[PDB]
GROMACS .gro file of N, CA and C in nm:
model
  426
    1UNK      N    1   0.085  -1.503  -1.507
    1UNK     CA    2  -0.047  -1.518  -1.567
    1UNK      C    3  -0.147  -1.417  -1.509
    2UNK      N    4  -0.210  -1.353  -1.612
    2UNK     CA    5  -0.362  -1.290  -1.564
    2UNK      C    6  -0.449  -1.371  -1.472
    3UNK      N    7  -0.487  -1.358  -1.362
    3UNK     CA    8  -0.634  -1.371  -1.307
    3UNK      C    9  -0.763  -1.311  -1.352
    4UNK      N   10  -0.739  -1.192  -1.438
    4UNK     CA   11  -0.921  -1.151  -1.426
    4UNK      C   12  -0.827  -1.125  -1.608
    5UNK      N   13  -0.960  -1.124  -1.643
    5UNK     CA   14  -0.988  -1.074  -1.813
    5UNK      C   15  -0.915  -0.916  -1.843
    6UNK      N   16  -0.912  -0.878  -2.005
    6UNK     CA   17  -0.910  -0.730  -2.003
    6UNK      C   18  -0.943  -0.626  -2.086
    7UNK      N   19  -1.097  -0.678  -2.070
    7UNK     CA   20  -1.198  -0.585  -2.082
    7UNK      C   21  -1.113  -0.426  -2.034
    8UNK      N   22  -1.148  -0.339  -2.138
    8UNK     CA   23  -1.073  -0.161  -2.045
    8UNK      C   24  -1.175  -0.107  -2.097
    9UNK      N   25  -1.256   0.002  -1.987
    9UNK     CA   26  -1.297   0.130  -2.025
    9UNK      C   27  -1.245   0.193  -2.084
   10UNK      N   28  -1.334   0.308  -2.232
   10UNK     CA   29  -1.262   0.436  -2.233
   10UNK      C   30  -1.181   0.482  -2.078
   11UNK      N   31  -1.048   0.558  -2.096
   11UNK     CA   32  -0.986   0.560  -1.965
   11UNK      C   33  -1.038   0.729  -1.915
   12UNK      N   34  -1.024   0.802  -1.818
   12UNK     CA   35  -1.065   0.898  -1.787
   12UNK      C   36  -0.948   0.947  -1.717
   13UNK      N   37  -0.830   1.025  -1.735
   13UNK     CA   38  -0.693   1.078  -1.647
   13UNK      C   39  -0.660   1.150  -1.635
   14UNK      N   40  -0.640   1.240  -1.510
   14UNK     CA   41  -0.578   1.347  -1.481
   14UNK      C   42  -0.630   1.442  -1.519
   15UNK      N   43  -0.740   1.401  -1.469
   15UNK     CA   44  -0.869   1.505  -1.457
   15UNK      C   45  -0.976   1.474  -1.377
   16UNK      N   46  -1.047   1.560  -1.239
   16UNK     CA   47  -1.081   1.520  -1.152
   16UNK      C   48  -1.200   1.433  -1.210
   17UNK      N   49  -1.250   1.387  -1.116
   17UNK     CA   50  -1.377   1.290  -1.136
   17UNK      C   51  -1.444   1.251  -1.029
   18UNK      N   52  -1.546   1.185  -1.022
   18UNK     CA   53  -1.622   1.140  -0.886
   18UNK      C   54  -1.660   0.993  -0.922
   19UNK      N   55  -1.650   0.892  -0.838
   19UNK     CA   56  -1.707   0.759  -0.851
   19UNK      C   57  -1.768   0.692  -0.797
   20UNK      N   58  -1.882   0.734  -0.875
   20UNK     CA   59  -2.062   0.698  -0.878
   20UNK      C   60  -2.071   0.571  -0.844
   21UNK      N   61  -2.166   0.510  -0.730
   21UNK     CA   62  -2.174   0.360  -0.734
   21UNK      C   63  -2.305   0.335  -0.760
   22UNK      N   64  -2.279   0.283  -0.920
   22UNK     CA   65  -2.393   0.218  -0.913
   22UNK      C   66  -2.484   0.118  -0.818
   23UNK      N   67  -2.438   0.082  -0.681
   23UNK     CA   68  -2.551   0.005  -0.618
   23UNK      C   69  -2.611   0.119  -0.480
   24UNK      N   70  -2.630   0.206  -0.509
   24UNK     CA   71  -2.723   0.289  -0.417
   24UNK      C   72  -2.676   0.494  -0.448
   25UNK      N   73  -2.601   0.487  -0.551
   25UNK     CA   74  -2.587   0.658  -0.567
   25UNK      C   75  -2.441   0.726  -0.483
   26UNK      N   76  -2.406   0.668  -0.408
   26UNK     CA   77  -2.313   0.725  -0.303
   26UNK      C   78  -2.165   0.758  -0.431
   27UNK      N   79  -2.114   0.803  -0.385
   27UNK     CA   80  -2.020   0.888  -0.463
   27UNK      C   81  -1.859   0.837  -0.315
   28UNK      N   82  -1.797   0.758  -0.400
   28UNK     CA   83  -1.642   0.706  -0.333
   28UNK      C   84  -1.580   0.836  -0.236
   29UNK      N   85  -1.589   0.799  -0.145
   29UNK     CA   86  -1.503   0.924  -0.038
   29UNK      C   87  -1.386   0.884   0.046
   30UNK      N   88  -1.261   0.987   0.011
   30UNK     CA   89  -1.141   0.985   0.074
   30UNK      C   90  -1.130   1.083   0.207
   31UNK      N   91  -1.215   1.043   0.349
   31UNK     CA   92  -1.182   1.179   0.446
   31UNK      C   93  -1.005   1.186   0.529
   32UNK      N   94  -1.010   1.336   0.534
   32UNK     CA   95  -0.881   1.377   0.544
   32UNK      C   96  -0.810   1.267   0.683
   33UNK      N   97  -0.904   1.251   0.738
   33UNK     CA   98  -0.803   1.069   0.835
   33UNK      C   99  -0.812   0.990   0.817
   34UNK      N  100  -0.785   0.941   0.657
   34UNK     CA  101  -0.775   0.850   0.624
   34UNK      C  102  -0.876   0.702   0.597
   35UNK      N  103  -0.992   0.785   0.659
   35UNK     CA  104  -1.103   0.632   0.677
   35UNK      C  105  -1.196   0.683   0.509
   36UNK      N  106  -1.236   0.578   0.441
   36UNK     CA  107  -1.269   0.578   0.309
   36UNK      C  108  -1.461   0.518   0.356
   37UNK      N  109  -1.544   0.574   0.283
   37UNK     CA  110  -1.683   0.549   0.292
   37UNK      C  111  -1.742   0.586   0.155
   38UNK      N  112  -1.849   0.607   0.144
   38UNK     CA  113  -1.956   0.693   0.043
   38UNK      C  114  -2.058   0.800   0.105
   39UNK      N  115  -2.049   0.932   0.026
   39UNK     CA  116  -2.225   1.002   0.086
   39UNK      C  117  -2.295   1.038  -0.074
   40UNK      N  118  -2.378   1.096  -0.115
   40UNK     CA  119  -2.464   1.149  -0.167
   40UNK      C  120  -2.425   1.264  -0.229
   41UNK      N  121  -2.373   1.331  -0.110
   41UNK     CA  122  -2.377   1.513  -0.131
   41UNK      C  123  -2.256   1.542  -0.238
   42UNK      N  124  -2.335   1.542  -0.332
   42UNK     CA  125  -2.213   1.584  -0.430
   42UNK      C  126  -2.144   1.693  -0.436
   43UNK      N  127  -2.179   1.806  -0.308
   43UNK     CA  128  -2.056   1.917  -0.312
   43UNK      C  129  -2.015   1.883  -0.212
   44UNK      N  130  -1.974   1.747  -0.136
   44UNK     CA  131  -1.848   1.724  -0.006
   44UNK      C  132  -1.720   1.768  -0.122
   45UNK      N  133  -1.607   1.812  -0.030
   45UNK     CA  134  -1.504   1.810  -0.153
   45UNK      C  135  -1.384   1.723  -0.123
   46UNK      N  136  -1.424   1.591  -0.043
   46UNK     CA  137  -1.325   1.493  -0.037
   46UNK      C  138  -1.412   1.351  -0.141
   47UNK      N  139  -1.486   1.376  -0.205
   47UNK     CA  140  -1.492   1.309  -0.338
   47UNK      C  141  -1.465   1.331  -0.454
   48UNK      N  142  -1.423   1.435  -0.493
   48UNK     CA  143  -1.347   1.452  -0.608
   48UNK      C  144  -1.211   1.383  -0.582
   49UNK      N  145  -1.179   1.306  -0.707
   49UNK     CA  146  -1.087   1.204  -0.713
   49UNK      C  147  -1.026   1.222  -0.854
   50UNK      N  148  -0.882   1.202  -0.879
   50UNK     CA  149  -0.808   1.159  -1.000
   50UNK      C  150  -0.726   1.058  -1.015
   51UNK      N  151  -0.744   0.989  -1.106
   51UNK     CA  152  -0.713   0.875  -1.187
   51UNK      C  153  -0.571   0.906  -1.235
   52UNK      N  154  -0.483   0.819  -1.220
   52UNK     CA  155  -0.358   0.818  -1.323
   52UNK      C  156  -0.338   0.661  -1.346
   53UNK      N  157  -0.240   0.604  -1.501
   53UNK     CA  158  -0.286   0.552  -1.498
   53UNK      C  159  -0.108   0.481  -1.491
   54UNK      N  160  -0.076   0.404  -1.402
   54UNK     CA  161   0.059   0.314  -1.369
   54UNK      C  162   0.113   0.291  -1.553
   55UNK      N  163   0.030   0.178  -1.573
   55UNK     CA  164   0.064   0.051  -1.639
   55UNK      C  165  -0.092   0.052  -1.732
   56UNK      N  166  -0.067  -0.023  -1.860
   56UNK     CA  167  -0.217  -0.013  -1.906
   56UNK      C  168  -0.316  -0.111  -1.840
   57UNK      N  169  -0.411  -0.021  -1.800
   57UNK     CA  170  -0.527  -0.110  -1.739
   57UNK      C  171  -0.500  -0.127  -1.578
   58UNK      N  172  -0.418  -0.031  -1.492
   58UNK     CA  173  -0.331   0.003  -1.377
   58UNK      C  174  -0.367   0.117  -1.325
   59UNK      N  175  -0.460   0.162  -1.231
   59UNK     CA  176  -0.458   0.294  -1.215
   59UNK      C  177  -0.400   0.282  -1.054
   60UNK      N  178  -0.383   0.457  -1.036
   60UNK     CA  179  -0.392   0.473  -0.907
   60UNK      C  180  -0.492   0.594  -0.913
   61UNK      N  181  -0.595   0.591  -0.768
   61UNK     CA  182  -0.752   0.684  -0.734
   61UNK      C  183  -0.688   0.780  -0.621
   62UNK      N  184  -0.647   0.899  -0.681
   62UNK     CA  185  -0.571   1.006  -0.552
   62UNK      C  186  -0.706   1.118  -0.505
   63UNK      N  187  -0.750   1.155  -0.383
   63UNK     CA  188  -0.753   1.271  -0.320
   63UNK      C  189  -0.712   1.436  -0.398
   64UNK      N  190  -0.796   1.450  -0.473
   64UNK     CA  191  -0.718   1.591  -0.545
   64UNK      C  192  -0.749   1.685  -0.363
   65UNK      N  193  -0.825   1.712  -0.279
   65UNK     CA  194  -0.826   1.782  -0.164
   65UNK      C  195  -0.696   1.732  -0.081
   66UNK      N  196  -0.685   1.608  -0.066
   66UNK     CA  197  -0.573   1.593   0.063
   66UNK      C  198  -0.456   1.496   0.009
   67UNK      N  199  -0.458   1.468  -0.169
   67UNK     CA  200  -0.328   1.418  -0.182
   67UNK      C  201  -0.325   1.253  -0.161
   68UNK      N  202  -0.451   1.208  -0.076
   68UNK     CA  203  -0.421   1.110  -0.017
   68UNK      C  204  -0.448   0.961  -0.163
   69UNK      N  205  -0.374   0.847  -0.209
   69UNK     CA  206  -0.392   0.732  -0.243
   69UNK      C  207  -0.532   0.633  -0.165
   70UNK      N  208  -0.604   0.605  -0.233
   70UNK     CA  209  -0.707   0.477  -0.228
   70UNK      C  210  -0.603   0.392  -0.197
   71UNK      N  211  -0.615   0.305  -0.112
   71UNK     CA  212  -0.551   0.160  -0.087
   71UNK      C  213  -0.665   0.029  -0.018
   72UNK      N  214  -0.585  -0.072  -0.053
   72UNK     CA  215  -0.632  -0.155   0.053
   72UNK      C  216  -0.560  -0.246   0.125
   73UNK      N  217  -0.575  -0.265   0.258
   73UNK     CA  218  -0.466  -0.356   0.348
   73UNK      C  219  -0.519  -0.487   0.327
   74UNK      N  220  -0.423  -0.549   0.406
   74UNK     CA  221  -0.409  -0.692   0.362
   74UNK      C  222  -0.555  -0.808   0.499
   75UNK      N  223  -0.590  -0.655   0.507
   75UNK     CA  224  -0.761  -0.717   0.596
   75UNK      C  225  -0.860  -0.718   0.475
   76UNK      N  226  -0.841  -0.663   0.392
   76UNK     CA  227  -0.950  -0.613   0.284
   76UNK      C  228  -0.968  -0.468   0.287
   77UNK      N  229  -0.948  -0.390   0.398
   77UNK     CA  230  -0.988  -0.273   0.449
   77UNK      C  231  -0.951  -0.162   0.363
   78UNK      N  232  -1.026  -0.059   0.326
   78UNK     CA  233  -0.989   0.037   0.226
   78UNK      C  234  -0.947   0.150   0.320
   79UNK      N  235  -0.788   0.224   0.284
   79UNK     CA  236  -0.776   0.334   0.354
   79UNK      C  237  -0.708   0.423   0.256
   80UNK      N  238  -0.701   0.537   0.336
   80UNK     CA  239  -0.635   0.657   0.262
   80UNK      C  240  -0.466   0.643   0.277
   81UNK      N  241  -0.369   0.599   0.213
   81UNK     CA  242  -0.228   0.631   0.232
   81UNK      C  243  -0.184   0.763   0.149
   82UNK      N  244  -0.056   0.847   0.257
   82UNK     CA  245   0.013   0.896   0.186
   82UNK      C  246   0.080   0.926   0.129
   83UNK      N  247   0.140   0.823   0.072
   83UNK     CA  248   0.204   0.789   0.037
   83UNK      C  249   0.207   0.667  -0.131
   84UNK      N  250   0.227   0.627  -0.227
   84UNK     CA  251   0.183   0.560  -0.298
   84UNK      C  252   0.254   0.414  -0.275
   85UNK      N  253   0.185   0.323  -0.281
   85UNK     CA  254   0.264   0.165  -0.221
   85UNK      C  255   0.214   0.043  -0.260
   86UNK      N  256   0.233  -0.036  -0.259
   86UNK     CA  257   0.218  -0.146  -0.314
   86UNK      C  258   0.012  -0.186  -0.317
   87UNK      N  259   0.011  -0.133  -0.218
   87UNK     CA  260  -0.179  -0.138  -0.191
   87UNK      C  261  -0.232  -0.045  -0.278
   88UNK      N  262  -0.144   0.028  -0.364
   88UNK     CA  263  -0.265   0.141  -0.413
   88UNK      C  264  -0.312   0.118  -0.547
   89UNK      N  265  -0.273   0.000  -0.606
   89UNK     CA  266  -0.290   0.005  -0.762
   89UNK      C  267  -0.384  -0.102  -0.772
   90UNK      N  268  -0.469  -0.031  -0.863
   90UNK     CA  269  -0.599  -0.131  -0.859
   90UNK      C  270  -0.602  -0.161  -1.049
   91UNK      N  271  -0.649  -0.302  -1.096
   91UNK     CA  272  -0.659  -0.331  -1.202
   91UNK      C  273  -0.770  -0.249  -1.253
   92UNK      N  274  -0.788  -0.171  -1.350
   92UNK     CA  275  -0.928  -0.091  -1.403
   92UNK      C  276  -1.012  -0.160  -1.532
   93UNK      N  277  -1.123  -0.209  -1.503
   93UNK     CA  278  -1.168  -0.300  -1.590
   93UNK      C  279  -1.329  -0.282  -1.604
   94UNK      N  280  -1.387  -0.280  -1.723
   94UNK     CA  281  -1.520  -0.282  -1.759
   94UNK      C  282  -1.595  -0.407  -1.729
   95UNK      N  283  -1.697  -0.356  -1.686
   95UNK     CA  284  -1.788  -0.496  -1.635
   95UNK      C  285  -1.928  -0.483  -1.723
   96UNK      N  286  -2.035  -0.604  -1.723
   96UNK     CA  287  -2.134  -0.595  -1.828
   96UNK      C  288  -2.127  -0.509  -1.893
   97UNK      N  289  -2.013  -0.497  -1.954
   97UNK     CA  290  -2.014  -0.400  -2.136
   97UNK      C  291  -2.033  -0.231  -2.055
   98UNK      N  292  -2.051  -0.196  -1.954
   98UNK     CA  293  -2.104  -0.055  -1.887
   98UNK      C  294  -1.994   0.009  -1.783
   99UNK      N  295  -2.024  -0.055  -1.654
   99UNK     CA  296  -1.944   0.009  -1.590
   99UNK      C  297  -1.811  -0.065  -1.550
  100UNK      N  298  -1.738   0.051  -1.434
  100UNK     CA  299  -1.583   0.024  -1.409
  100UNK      C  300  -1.588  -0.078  -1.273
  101UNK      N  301  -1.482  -0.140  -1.288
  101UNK     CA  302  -1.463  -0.206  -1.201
  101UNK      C  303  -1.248  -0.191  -1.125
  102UNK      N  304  -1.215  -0.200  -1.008
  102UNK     CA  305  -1.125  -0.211  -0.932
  102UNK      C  306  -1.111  -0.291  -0.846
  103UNK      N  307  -1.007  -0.349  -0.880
  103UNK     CA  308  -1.008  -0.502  -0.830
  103UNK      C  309  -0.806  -0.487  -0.795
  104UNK      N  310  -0.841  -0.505  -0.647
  104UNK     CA  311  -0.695  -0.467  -0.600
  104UNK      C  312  -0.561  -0.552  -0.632
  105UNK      N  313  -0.455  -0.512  -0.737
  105UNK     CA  314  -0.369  -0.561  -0.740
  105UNK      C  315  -0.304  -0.662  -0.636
  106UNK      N  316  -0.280  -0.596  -0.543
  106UNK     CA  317  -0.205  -0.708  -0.523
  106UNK      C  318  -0.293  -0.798  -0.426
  107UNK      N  319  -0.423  -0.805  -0.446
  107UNK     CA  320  -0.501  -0.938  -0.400
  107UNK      C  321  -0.560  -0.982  -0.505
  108UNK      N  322  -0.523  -0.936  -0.583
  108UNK     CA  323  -0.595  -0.965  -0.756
  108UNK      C  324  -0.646  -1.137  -0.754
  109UNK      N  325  -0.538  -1.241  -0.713
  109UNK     CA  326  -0.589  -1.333  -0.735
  109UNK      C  327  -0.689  -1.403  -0.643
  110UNK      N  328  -0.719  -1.309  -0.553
  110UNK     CA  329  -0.796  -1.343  -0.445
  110UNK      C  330  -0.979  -1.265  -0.491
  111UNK      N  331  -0.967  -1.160  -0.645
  111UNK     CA  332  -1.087  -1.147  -0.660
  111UNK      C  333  -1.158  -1.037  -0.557
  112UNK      N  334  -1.041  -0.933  -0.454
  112UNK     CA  335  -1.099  -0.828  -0.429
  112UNK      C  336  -1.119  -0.715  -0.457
  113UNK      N  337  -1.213  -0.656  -0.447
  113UNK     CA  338  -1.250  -0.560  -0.533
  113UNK      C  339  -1.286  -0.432  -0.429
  114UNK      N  340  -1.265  -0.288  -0.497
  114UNK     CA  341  -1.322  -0.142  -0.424
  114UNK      C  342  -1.509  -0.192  -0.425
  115UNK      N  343  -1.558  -0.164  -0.333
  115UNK     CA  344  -1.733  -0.194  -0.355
  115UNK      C  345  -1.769  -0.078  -0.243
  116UNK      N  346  -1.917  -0.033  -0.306
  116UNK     CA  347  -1.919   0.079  -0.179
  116UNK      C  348  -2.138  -0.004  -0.145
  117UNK      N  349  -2.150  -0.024  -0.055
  117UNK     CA  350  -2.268  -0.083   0.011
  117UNK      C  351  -2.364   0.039  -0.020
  118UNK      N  352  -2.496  -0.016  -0.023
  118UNK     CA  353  -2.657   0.113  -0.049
  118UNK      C  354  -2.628   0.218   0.077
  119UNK      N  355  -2.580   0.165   0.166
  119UNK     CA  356  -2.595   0.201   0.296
  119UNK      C  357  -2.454   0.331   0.301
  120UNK      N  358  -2.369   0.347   0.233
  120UNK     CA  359  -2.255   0.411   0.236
  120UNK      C  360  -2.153   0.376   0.264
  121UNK      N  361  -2.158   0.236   0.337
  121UNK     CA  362  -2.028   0.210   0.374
  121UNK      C  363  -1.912   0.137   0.239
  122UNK      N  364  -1.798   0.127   0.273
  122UNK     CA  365  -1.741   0.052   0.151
  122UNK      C  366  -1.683  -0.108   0.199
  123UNK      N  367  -1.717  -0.220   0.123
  123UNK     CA  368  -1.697  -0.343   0.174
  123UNK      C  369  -1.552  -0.429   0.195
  124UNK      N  370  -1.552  -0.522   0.313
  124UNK     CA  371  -1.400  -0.526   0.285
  124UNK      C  372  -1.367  -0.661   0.183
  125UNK      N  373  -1.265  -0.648   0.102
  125UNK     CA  374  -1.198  -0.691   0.001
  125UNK      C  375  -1.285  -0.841  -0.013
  126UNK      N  376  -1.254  -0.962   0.086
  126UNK     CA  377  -1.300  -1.134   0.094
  126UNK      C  378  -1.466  -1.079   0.052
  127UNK      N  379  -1.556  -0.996   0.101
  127UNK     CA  380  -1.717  -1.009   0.111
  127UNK      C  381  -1.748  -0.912  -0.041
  128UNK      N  382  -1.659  -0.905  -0.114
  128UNK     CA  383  -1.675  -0.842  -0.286
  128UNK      C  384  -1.648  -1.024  -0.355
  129UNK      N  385  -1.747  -0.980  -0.499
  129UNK     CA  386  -1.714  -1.064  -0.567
  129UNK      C  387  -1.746  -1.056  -0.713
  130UNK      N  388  -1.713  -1.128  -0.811
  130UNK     CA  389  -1.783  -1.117  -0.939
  130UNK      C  390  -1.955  -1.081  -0.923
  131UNK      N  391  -2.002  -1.028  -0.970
  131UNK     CA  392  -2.151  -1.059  -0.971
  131UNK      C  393  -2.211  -0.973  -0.880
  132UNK      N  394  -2.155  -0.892  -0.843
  132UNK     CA  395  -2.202  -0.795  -0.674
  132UNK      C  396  -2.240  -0.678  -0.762
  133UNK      N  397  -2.382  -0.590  -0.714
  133UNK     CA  398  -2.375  -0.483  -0.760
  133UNK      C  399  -2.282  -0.379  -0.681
  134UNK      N  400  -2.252  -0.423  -0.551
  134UNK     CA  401  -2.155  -0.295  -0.529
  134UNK      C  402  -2.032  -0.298  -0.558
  135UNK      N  403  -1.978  -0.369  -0.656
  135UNK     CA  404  -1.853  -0.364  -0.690
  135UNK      C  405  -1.847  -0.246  -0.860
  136UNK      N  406  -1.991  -0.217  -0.858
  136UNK     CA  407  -2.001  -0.154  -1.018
  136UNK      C  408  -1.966  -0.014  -1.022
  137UNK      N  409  -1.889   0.108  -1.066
  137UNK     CA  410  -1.927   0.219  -1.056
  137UNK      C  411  -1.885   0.271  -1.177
  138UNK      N  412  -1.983   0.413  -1.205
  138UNK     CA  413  -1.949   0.559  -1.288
  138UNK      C  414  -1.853   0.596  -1.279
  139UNK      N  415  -1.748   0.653  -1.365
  139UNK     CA  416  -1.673   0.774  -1.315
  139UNK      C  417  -1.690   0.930  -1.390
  140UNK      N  418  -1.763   1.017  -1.353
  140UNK     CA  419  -1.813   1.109  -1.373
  140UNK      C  420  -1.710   1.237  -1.408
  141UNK      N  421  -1.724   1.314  -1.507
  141UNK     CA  422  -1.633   1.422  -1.512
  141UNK      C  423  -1.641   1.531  -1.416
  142UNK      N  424  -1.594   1.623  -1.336
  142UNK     CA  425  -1.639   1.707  -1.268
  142UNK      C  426  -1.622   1.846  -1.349
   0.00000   0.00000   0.00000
């Protein structure tokens, strides 16, 4: 059985992109050791990111600079693997009719989600929820 609905964005793949958070501007960042945050500066070049897409409504968010997979561990914690694995596939889903939402497979029924804080940081998996603006983001063409 589904846990979450399936609402789908137009999809955007395999073609770089950046992902805009709607709750303070910060732009999703993969740095080359692996620790995942947000900044502003839209010419860092460990935010450019590409989308592929598993399964429909399945993506995986790769590192076009270092290769590296979006994941999240089983703390909530978002990291860079290099590898692709069971943590990296996130459900891709439209929220209020606008933006995207990622909501980690395999905690899916637990309702965690990628969220990046005003402040830059990104939240761990249990402290996301329906209804959060930092769980909302853009994904921008580059």
């Amino acid at each position: 059985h589904h846990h979450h609905h399936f609402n789908l964005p137009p999809g955007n793949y395999k073609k770089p992109v950046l992902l805009y958070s709607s709750n303070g501007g910060h732009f999703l960042r993969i740095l080359p050791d692996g620790t995942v945050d947000g900044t502003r500066d839209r010419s860092d070049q460990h935010i450019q990111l590409q989308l592929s897409a598993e399964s429909v409504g399945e993506v995986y968010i790769k590192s076009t600079e270092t290769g590296q997979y979006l994941a999240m561990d089983t703390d909530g914690l978002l990291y860079g693997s290099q590898t692709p694995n069971e943590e990296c596939l996130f459900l891709e889903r439209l929220e209020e009719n606008h933006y995207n939402t990622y909501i980690s497979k395999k905690h899916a029924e637990k309702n965690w989600f990628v969220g990046l804080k005003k402040n830059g940081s990104v939240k761990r998996g249990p402290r996301t929820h329906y209804g959060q603006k930092a769980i909302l983001f853009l994904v921008l063409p580059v």
